[PDB]
């Protein structure tokens, strides 16, 4: 269950967001920026809002609760009042099928 | 438009609610108890920012805006009710009828062209369960039941209570009241021990978001509200821990109460059963102005005869009022006052960091934004402005 | 620019007046009685929003702005008059001449280049009829007669009075005083009964509106004012009715007073004769700031010798002051205060609903708007501003 | 950000300083004395407009912002320290560690996703010379020495003092303290006579502008400040004259004090020697909010052992505190307050008319504008804002 | 019944003309383009003379507080006015303007 | 009498030069385009040096509070300045700038 099957790449239009629910775990949000796919936790770090119900502006997702925002590629805050980075999950497309990582990316074994 | 547009633009889920700093117009609101207004003795009060006058004539209540049409003085500065059905301004004697607000006479100039052509604003007033409700709105009013919680108007339901002015915006009072986790502030209430109540410290939510509440928008009477269902799938917290060690315990009393909690527009909470398994509690947070509200507390208990009513009143006075309405709810008063600074500049509506149980508050904010009957504005207070 | 431009745009008939919240600059104003300031004993006061200091040197009065040019502190915090003709700031000892406000010395630095190169604002001061008048304006002042009601300065006129600070904008005081129908608030005055005065409840106007008032656009001394002529062709109302039934009656005394009433710029009312056939009454409503004014009351009676003046003084103290100045006018004080809220947000100037007798007030608003000598602004208080 | 842009554009020489109404962020500030904060006894205070909580745990001081992340209430309304290393909000039991402000537990919901994922603001706290300094800034703090006057931290310098809240903006306090000519307000101080001090009334400057001060920006510890050198080329004024005649003289005592006077960022003055030839005086004017500051006074005297320290302490209590800290500096308190009105609308920063000795104040305004570590804004208080 | 005001040519489009009546309240006649209308002259919100106001199209603005009415219907167009103005019949016969002595 | 200040070319257009005078208040010489003007250097509103201010056309802005003066007439152009500046006639002959010794 390292890679979670989400949907067919063609099932998502550019600039859309899809929520991925997981048993016994917090939901994720998969974003399609152009022809690329990204994913983060679905719950806004500033509260209890669902980012999949927000608005995607390019590679920046805006929370529907207070207007906070995050960069979907890095998970870093883009607009106040958000200050806590989102956990980011790797996404890959195999056979035109979108898969999202079951574990978040870590500042472990990567670029210095 | 009572708030910075920049802020309203940020709270897309409940902007009307955030803008409703002065309350919602076109709803009924309790302002005093029937026994507080006597025949032929006008009483003043401020509701939704407007100064009003209420009078009882032949046992029926009438409400006139307490502001002369002429130079805008409050008639109440020097009350002159010269005939049973009218009130005369103490300044230039413009006289108004209590029943329709029509300017029927002017003692300083009985030939004035204004006579019979102007009308002072009147508001509908209705008495129910010994409570005085004023419809702060325009046009024919809807039935009172629409703006009251279920069962409040039941025939056998005997209502008793108290009212006072509290220093906080009405919304802070509403949210605190419907706040599932604020139960923590009541852990040391005398009502807990003195009435052997079962009272957790909080709740560990269970189930999905939709399951946390029940939004009512299909009530035959038109009622609009939200039920707090956090306890249906949640695990009540009776042992609070820090670092794994228990530092606080809930109340392991035998009496089960407050298992049915709901908030209703325009802003009234229903707690059942409370403060005792055989009673029902209702409390309103009525907007007086942007900084204050009436904390209208009412407790109901079915009574079939005068004997039970008398007995009920005795217990209310000797136990329920002091032990519950005050001994329990007093902590709610300073709690709401504690949030004033954070929301005073309207910034709190953006910077607040909510957690799971606030799902109930969010549901309320959305219900209120979608089903309120109007946003009271400062212009309603000074005089509507427009150019068509 | 003291009021929202949107409001000023609406009141086309008298925008300057509505904008004059701080009063009219370049007019004389009474601020205290001569006996209140003694030789070498500086006194503080605030006029048109400006803090002032008045001193008597060799019997003559001098007025300097009570604000040091250096760091803007009030010199009066710690008065240091080290020589008869000067005052030294308590902070860094900048010293000014009372005569012309020139910075003549600086004790902390006798070599400063500022010496003789700066001047503290001074204002003309004149004593007349035992009253101290200050010309709160710029340049050479006009004769005091221009800003006083007719006859106030008559040689034989003996003036006695009272002064106090009242909490209302000066304009509310002026309008109430010149208000023909406000007479209704005086119906129960002890003066009416104790001095057997005839006093109607109001008036039913007669004739065209042009006949309701008499505007004086120019006097031998440039006076600007308006006379209330509602009683010329109007019918005095002595029976107040509601629905046809008499609920109140006016006073049927034998003494007829207030033959003529006139208001004059900068804001002084003349009632003649009052409160008795042999006397003349004048009252000023002097702007202190946007929320308060001096209620400077004066009663005049022609006296030919010291004997008559003495007798007059006795009558004033034992009868006229308590029965009229206080017994009659005290009701005017709370009446003015009652209009504060409605006009506080400047909206009352738009929402007021006027009736016939208000033709007098309208004439005053227009006269004041067309002939005032300047609008005092907050910039006059802090320091006039202008960028190239 | 805190002042009308039109005003800031006018003061091109020190706009940052004029905008710093709330003080400079990222600097150390003393707020109380060590003996005032005891083990497990949380104390509240407001610094740079922010409400803070300080507590001593196992002897070490910790500082947490006194505002729960949840609904923005002050934790101090009802303090709940359930474990030695944490504090629990009285509202919904969100619990924070004093050590790093991490939200480590939530009693009302032990399953909350917020746990371990939020952090309450904390600020570095350091005790030195019996004084509690808080670094009201972000990131790793600089050495305390950078924000203290030279010698304050000397090994043998025994520090004693007094602190209180004064009603004036901190800058008015700083300028009055470094004001060479304000010495005039101290001419009648009991300290002058009672301690045989030599004290002129002011100074006649000499030399050019550059020579009036010494701007320090080469200090190895990074401290930034200005020395008042008016007395190096100036002639002290002992005979104050008006029209060339002597009206006041300075003090001809034997003791020479205040050889060197210097002001340092963030706002602390050093006067040496004072109030006696063998002592050193330092005073801070710490911003609490836009209208108030802490007047943190400290007196230092070299002591080699406990005997001398105790002797000094006794002299401090019986003489130096009442004679100097109060008997001398009390006049500085009302002097600062006297400037409030002129600068309250921010216009005094434009209308002030300065003279020669103010070169010292100008030098300070420029230094502060160029070397401050950040301008505190209302957004820092409510929560920093940033869009897109 | 119908009272004589003036000749349709004496009024330029967009102008107002006060009509004083003996023993009665004054009226105001407005020429909106080539059509004429009439209402009470006194503003219903006070004692102002609307003929001293400003006409913008078919809307007259009161000089006292800026309230306004539609001169055709007499209905309030701008606050603070709320009471409809009385409308009077107007007819132009033989190039002459006539106003009904009574409102409709 | 006249004081020889400098060569016209010693000043770039739109610049200001302070002229110190022993036992006298310093002066400010302004070069506006190809024209030269002179006034007292000390702002009349305080202790600021106008030669350290901003020249906008023929108006000098004080560096302290934004007050301003017209360098040709010496009259205040912007508040808080109210006291007129002392003006000194300037003459340029053979590329040399001369400033009158006395104010006028
Ligand atoms: S919950 Fe997302 S910005 Fe607040
Ligand atoms: S203000 Fe009421 S009658 Fe005039
Ligand atoms: S403030 Fe008056 S001399 Fe300095
Ligand atoms: S406001 Fe502190 S836990 Fe809710
Ligand atoms: S009198 Fe016409 S708008 Fe008020
Ligand atoms: S010192 Fe030049 S404008 Fe103030
Ligand atoms: Fe509660
Ligand atoms: Fe009166
Ligand atoms: Fe001092």
Instruction: Flag if B359 and A64 touch (Cβ within 8 Å).
Output: no
10 Å CB burial of residue D289 (0-12, 13-18, 19+) is: middle
Nearest ligand atom owner, CA of C359: 5
> Which atom number of ligand 6 is nearest to the Cα of residue D353?
4
Resolution rounded to one decimal, in angstroms:
1.9
Closest to E31 (Cα-Cα) out of E57, E2, E52, E53:
E57
- Percent helix / strand / coil, chain F, rounded to 5: 5, 45, 45
F-B interface (Cβ pairs under 8 Å ≥ 3): no
Which candidate, C164, C124, C202, C188, places its Cα nearest to that of C327?
Answer: C188
Contact residues, chain B, for C242 at CB < 8 Å:
82-83, 86, 88, 95, 104-105, 107
D382 sits in the region (left: phi over 0; alpha: psi -120 to 50; else beta) called alpha
Please tell me what DSSP assigns to residue B78.
Answer: G
Does the distance separating the beta carbons of D113 and A43 come in below 8 Å? yes
Tell me whether residues C83 and D245 touch, CB distance under 8 A: yes
* B43 within 8 A of B34, measured Cβ to Cβ: no
Query: CA-CA distance, D200 to D185, in Å (whole number)?
Result: 11
Residue B384 with chain E: CB contacts under 8 Å:
79
> Is C113 part of the contact surface with chain F (CB cutoff 8 Å)?
yes
- Chain C residues touching chain B at CB-CB below 8 Å: 179, 181-185, 201-205, 237, 240-243, 245, 247-248, 334-335, 338-339, 341-343, 345, 347-348, 350-357
Region for residue D6 given its phi and psi (left: phi exceeds 0; alpha: psi -120 to 50; beta: otherwise): alpha
CA distance linking residue D44 with residue D66, whole number of Å: 8
Q: Is the C-beta atom of F64 inside 6 A of ligand 6?
A: yes
C73 falls within a domain: yes
Q: Where does ligand 1 bind, in terms of residues with CB under 6 Å?
A: A 44, 46-47, 49, 63, 65-66, 68, 81-82
Q: Which atom of ligand 3 is nearest to the CA of C75?
A: 2
Of the candidates B201, B350, B354, the beta carbon closest to that of D108 is on B201
Count: domains in chain D: 3
**In this complex, is the C-beta atom of B13 within 8 Å of any C-beta atom belonging to chain A?**
yes
Q: Which of C309, C302, C307 is nearest to C276 (CA)?
A: C302
Q: How was this structure determined?
A: X-ray
Cis peptide before E80 (omega within 30 of 0): yes
Residue with tokens 């189930």: B207
List all residues whose CB is within 6 A of at least one atom of ligand 5. E 43, 45-46, 48, 62, 64-65, 67, 80-81
Burial of C115 (0-12, 13-18, 19+ CB in 10 A): middle
Task: Show Cβ contacts of residue C145 under 8 Å, excluding neighbours closer than 6 positions.
Answer: C153, C221, C223
Q: What token pair was written down for C337? A: 């205060």
Report the relative pairing of strands D43-47 and D50-57 from DSSP bridges. antiparallel
CA-proximal residue: ligand 6, atom 3 (nearest)? F67
Task: Indicate whether C265 and C282 sit together in one domain.
Answer: yes
C-beta of residue C75 within 8 angstroms of C-beta of residue C162: no
All chains having 3 or more CB pairs closer than 8 angstroms to chain D: A, B, C, F
Interface test with B, best of E24, E79, E83, E85 (most B CBs within 10 A): E79
Distance CA D36, CA D43 (A): 9
Domain assignment present for residue D256? The answer is yes
Q: Is residue D90 part of a domain?
A: yes
Distance (Å, whole) CA B27 – CA E31: 45
Q: Residues C337, C355: one domain? A: yes
In this complex, whether A and C touch, counting 3 or more CB pairs under 8 angstroms, is no
- D179 part of a folded domain: yes
What is the whole-number distance in angstroms between the Cα of residue F70 and the centre of ligand 3? 29
d(CA D283, CA D162): 10
For C59-89, letters b (16+ CB in 10 Å) and e give: eebbbbbbbbbbbbbbbbbbbbbbeebbbbb
Phi/psi at C63 (nearest 5 deg)?
A: -130, 125
Q: What residue spans of chain F are helical by DSSP H?
A: none
Within-domain flag for D388: no
User: CA-CA distance, E99 to E2, in Å (whole number)?
Assistant: 5
Q: Round to whole Å and give the CA distance between D274 and D293.
A: 23
CA of C352 to the centre of ligand 2 (A): 10
Contacts of F43 (CB under 8 A, 6+ apart): F49, F50, F53, F62, F64, F67, F81
How distant, in Å, are the alpha carbons of B1, B19, B283, B343, D167 from that of B171? Answer: 17, 11, 13, 10, 34
Q: Are D30 and D131 in contact (CB under 8 A)?
A: yes
Three-state secondary structure call for residue B186? helix
| Gyration radius (Cα) of chain D, Å | 23
Torsion sign over Cα B174, B180, B182, B185: positive
- State which of D89, D106, D110, D114 you would mutate to test the pocket of ligand 4, scoring each by most atoms of that ligand within 8 A of its C-beta: D89
The answer to whether residues C215 and C363 touch, using CB atoms and an 8 Å cutoff, is yes
Please give the Cα distance from A103 to A106 (Å, whole number): 9
| D267 & D154 share domain | yes
* Residue B321 domain flag: yes
> What does the buried/exposed string (b/e) look like for B194-219 if buried means 16 or more CB atoms within 10 Å of the residue's CB?
ebebbbbbbbbbeeeeeebbebbeee
Question: Could you tell me if B144 and B53 lie in one domain?
Answer: no
Q: Which atom of ligand 1 is nearest to the CA of A69?
A: 3
Residue B41, both tokens:
């003795």
3-class DSSP string for D146-200? HHCCCCCCCCCEEEEEECCEECCCHHHHHHHHHCHHHHHHHCCCHHHHHCCEEEC
Pairing of strands F16-21, C27-33: unpaired
Half-sphere exposure for B288 (CA within 13 Å, toward CB):
18
Instruction: Determine the distance in angstroms separating the CA of B106 from the nearest CA of chain C, rounded to an integer.
Output: 8
Using CA atoms, how far residue F31 sits from B386, C333, F49, in Å, is 57, 64, 16
Q: Are chains A and E in contact at 3+ CB pairs closer than 8 Å?
A: no
Domain A1-112 sits in CATH at 2.102.10.10
Selection from C50, C26, C45, C270 nearest residue C163 by Cα: C45
Residues listed for chain D: 388
Q: Which subunits count as partners of chain C given 3+ CB pairs below 8 Å?
A: B, D, E, F
Residue C388 lies in a domain: no
Separation in Å, CA C101 to CA C62, C76, C95, C105: 10, 15, 9, 11
Q: Which residues surround ligand 8, an ion (CB under 5 A)?
A: C 332
Task: Read off the tokens for D133.
Answer: 């300094």
Span from the CA of D185 to the centroid of ligand 9 (angstroms): 7
Query: Hey, CA dihedral for C299, C300, C304, C305, is it positive or negative?
Result: positive
State the alpha helices, DSSP H only, in B214-260. 230-233
Q: Please name the residues in contact with B177: beta carbons below 8 A apart, sequence gap of 6 or more.
A: B263, B269, B283, B285, B332
Nearest to F19 by CA among F34, F32, F2: F2
Under CATH, which architecture does the E1-104 domain have?
A: 3-layer Sandwich (2.102)
The reply to whether A108 sits in an annotated binding site is no
Rounded to the nearest 10 degrees, what angle do helices B330-338 and B170-178 cross at? 120
Q: How crowded is residue B82: how many other Cβ atoms within 10 Å of its Cβ?
A: 19
Report phi then psi at B36, rounded to 5.
-95, -5
Contact in structure between C285 and C295 (CB atoms under 8 Å): yes
Number of CB atoms found within 10 A of residue E71's CB: 27
* Burial class (CB within 10 angstroms; exposed 0-12, middle 13-18, buried 19+) of A2: exposed
- Whole-angstrom Cα distance, residue A77 to residue A60? 9
Which residues in F31-64 are b (16+ Cβ under 10 Å) and which e? bbeeebbbbbbbbbbbbbbbbebebeebbbbbbb
Chain A (8-37) residues lying within 8 Å, Cβ to Cβ, of chain D: 26
Neighbours of B80 (CB within 10 A): 17
By Cβ distance, the residue of B69, B73, B111 closest to C204 is: B111
Task: Report which of D72, D71, D73, D53 is spatially closest to residue D63, judged by C-alpha positions.
Answer: D53
| Chain D closest-CA separation from residue A39 CA (Å) | 19
CB contact under 8 A, F68 and C388: yes
Separation CA C73–CA D236 (nearest Å): 25
Q: List Cα–Cα distances, B194 to B190, B324, C54, D237, in angstroms.
A: 6, 10, 70, 78
CA of D234 to the centre of ligand 3 (A): 20
What is the residue-wise DSSP string for D305-372? SHHHHHHHHHHIIIIIIIIIIITTTHHHHHHHHHTHHHHHTS-HHHH----GGGHHHHHHHHHHHHH-
Contact call for D11 and F65, based on CB within 8 A: yes
Task: Give Cα D36 to chain centroid, integer Å.
Answer: 18
Task: Tell me which chain D residues have a C-beta less than 8 angstroms from the C-beta of A67.
Answer: 387
D30 and D134: one domain? yes
CB-side neighbour CA atoms (13 Å) of A92 = 8
Q: How far apart are CA B328 and CA B190, in angstroms?
A: 7
Residues of E in contact with B113 (CB under 8 A): 25, 42
Q: Which of ligand 4's atoms lies nearest the C-alpha of D68? A: 2
Inter-chain contacts counted by CB atoms under 8 A, chains C and D: 106
Cβ-based neighbours of A108, under 8 Å, separated by 6 or more: none
Tokens representing D357? 């000795």
Residue whose CA lies nearest to ligand 4 atom number 1: D71
Cβ distance D383 to A80 less than 8 Å, yes or no, reads yes
Of D185, D205, D245, the CB nearest to C91: D185
Question: Which of C348, C341, C364, B94 shows the shortest CA–CA distance to E65?
Answer: C348
Hey, is the C-beta of A56 within 8 angstroms of any chain D C-beta? no
* D164 and D94 in a common domain: no
Residue B97: which H helix or E strand, with range? strand B94-97
D149 and D225 in contact (C-beta within 8 Å)?
yes
Picking from D189, D356, D168, the residue whose alpha carbon sits closest to that of residue D258 is D189
Report the chain B residue with the minimal C-alpha distance to residue E69. Answer: B387
Q: Which of C11, C209, C359 sits opposite E65 (nearest CB)?
A: C11
Backbone interruptions in chain C following residues (C to N > 2.5 Å) = none
Q: Is residue B232 domain-shared with residue B95, that is, in the same domain? A: no
Cβ distance of F83 and C385 shorter than 8 Å: no
Residues E50/E14, Cβ–Cβ less than 8 Å: no
Q: How many Å apart are CA B272 and CA B279, to the nearest integer?
A: 7
Q: Which of D134, D165, D163 lies closest to D292, judged by CA?
A: D165
Burial of D259 (0-12, 13-18, 19+ CB in 10 A): exposed
Contact criterion met (CB below 8 Å) for B180 and B230 = yes
C-beta separation of D180 from D203 below 8 A: yes
User: For the domain that residue D60 is a member of, what is the CATH number?
Assistant: 2.20.25.680
B324 within a domain of the structure (yes/no): yes
B-chain CB neighbours of D74 within 8 Å are: 338, 341
* Crossing angle between the packed helical segments B359-371 and B170-178, to the nearest 10 degrees: 130
Atom of ligand 1 nearest to the CA of A48: 1
In this structure, are residues A44 and A65 in contact, taking their beta carbons and an 8 Å threshold? yes
F6 is in an annotated binding site: no
Tell me how far apart the alpha carbons of residues C121 and C102 are, in angstroms, rounded to a whole number.
9
**Tokens, residue E42:** 């006194």
Nearest of C74, B96, B195, B42 to residue D342 by alpha carbon: C74
Q: How far apart are CA B128 and CA C128, in angstroms?
A: 68
Same domain, B115 and B128: no
Number of other residues whose CB lies within 10 A of the CB of residue D266: 27
CB atoms A66 and B358 under 8 Å: no
Considering CB atoms only, which of C77, C91, C112 is closest to D184? Answer: C91
Q: What is the largest CA-CA distance in chain B?
A: 84
Q: What is the domain range of residue C321? A: 4-25+139-383
Give every CB contact of residue F23 below 8 A, 6+ residues apart in sequence: none
CATH number, domain at D88? 2.20.25.10
Cα(C174)–Cα(C267) distance, rounded to whole angstroms? 6
Please provide residue D184's backbone torsions phi and psi, each rounded to the nearest 5 degrees: -60, -35
């Amino acid at each position: 269950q390292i890679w979670l099957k989400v949907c067919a790449a063609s099932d998502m239009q550019p600039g859309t967001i899809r929520r991925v629910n997981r048993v016994g775990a917090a939901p994720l949000a998969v974003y399609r920026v152009g022809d690329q796919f990204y994913a983060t936790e679905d719950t806004c770090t500033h509260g209890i809002a669902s980012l999949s119900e927000g608005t995607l502006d390019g590679d920046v997702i805006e929370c529907p609760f207070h207007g906070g925002a995050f960069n979907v590629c890095t998970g870093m805050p883009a607009s106040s009042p958000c200050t806590v980075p989102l956990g980011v999950f790797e996404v890959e497309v195999k056979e035109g099928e979108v898969y999202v990582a079951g574990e978040k990316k870590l500042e472990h074994h990567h670029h210095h | 438009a009572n708030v910075d547009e920049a802020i309203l633009k940020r709270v897309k889920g409940w902007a009307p609610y955030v803008d409703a700093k002065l309350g919602f117009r076109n709803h009924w609101y309790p302002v005093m108890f029937s026994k507080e207004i006597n025949e032929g003795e006008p009483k003043t009060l401020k509701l939704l920012g407007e100064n009003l006058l209420v009078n009882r004539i032949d046992g029926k209540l009438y409400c006139l805006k307490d502001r002369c049409l002429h130079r805008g003085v409050q008639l109440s500065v020097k009350v002159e009710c010269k005939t049973k059905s009218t009130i005369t301004c103490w300044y230039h004697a413009w006289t108004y009828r209590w029943e329709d607000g029509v300017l029927c006479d002017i003692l300083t100039n009985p030939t004035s062209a204004q006579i019979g052509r102007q009308k002072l604003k009147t508001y509908p007033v209705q008495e129910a369960k010994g409570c005085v409700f004023i419809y702060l709105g325009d046009g024919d009013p809807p039935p009172l039941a629409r703006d009251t919680p279920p069962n409040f108007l039941d025939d056998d339901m005997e209502i008793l209570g108290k009212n006072q002015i509290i220093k906080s915006n009405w919304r802070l009072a509403v949210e605190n009241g419907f706040d599932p986790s604020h139960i923590y502030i009541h852990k040391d209430s005398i009502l807990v021990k003195d009435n052997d109540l079962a009272l957790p410290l909080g709740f560990a939510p269970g189930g999905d978001r939709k399951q946390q509440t029940r939004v009512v928008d299909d009530d035959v009477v038109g009622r609009k509200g939200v039920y707090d269902l956090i306890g249906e799938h949640g695990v009540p917290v009776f042992e609070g821990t820090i670092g794994g060690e228990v530092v606080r315990e809930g109340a392991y009393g035998e009496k089960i109460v407050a298992n049915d909690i709901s908030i209703w527009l325009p802003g009234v909470l229903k707690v059942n059963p409370f403060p005792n398994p055989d009673m029902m509690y209702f409390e309103w947070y009525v907007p007086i102005d942007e900084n204050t509200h009436y904390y209208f507390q009412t407790l109901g208990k079915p009574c079939a005869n005068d004997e039970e009513r008398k007995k009920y009143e005795q217990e209310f006075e000797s136990k329920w009022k002091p032990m519950a309405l005050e001994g329990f709810n007093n902590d709610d008063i300073w709690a709401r006052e504690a949030m004033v600074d954070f929301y005073a500049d309207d910034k709190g509506w953006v910077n607040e960091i909510l957690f799971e149980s606030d799902e109930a508050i969010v549901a309320w904010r959305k219900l209120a934004s979608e089903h309120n009957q109007g946003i009271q504005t400062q212009a309603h207070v000074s005089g509507l402005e427009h150019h068509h």
